[PDB]
Amino acid sequence: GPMGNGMNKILPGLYIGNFKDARDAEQLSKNKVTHILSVHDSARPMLEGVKYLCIPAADSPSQNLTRHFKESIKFIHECRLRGESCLVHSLAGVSRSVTLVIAYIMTVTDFGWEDALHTVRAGRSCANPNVGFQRQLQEFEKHEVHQYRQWLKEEYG
């Protein structure tokens, strides 16, 4: 459905869901979620037992998400390197959250944005960044992802 069917594993330690999934104690426990990247209109810390990164942002082509790629990647990566699990969520788990996860996948692989989107969709079929986020990801692939891959190597080996 258009808001998914529960949070979905994208890679080990990396999940995407909707806002309800992000407060679902059963889902959070089953998936061992200890970090939440919340990217939606009213993102703020809510639950106990969870490290948050909160990015108030709209699901619109006029919303800049590129300026949040680096902090999102650092947050996700440092969680995953410690063997912990991170949920990236938006309202629907379709666009804002998916875009940040695509940037992450592009940085930890050699993938362009389309192969990264394919990866996300294999785990969460409803993934579909808005057309503006798609263009931001294309620009990121063209001009900056190679700098991010080098930063990742320098900072984390």
Author numbering: -1 to 155
The publication says:
DUSP22 is a small phosphatase containing 184 residues, and the sequence contains a catalytic domain as well as an N-terminal myristoylation site. This enzyme is broadly expressed in different tissues and plays important roles in the regulation of signaling pathways, such as inactivating the T cell receptor (TCR) signaling pathway, activating the JNK signaling pathway, and regulating the phosphorylation of focal adhesion kinase (FAK). The phosphatase domain of DUSP22 consists of five twisted β-sheets and six α-helices, and the structural scaffold is similar to that of DUSP3 (VHR), while DUSP22 does not contain an N-terminal α-helix surrounded by the N-loop. In this region, the catalytic activity is facilitated by C88 in the P-loop and D57 in the D-loop, and the hydrogen bonding network is formed by D57 in the D-loop, S93 in the P-loop, and N128 in the N-loop.
The S93 mutants were combined with a second mutation, C88S, to produce proteins for growing better crystals, which improved the resolution (<1.6 Å) and helped to determine the structures. The crystal structure of C88S was prepared to compare with the double mutants, and it formed the DPN–triloop interaction, which was similar to the WT.
